[PDB]
Amino acid sequence: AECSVDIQGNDQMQFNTNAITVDKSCKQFTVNLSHPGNLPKNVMGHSWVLSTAADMQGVVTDGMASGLDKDYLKPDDSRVIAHTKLIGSGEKDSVTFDVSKLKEGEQYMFFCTNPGHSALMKGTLTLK
Ligand SMILES: [Cu+2]
Numbered sequence: 001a002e003c004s005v006d007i008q009g010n011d012q013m014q015f016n017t018n019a020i021t022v023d024k025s026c027k028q029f030t031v032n033l034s035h036p037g038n039l040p041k042n043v044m045g046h047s048w049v050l051s052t053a054a055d056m057q058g059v060v061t062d063g064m065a066s067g068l069d070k071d072y073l074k075p076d077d078s079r080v081i082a083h084t085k086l087i088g089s090g091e092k093d094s095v096t097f098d099v100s101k102l103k104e105g106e107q108y109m110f111f112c113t114n115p116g117h118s119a120l121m122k123g124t125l126t127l128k
Pocket of ligand 1: 045
């Protein structure tokens, strides 16, 4: 499964990876996120967002201020490189983005923007 990754958000507020790797070769990269467990959207909801390590906190803060009705993310947030939808147990989501967006010298992070979550649920993304 080149140019893509299979990542899970669970009931204990953890992704199963903190380091994701993007093959330089890919024009596009796709992230398939799922949520093993039994806790629902309003209780243990997860989403995957991508941004530079520097923009992460503004993205989490304004996301948080973007309610559960907007999937806890400022719609059309410019610092958001890519993002999945917010999901609960049993559900799945996927997203594909343009590798060209990943620029050089940049530090990228992925993180869940549900309140209380981003601290634990985060890892780096590196264009190798
Ligand atoms: Cu989460």
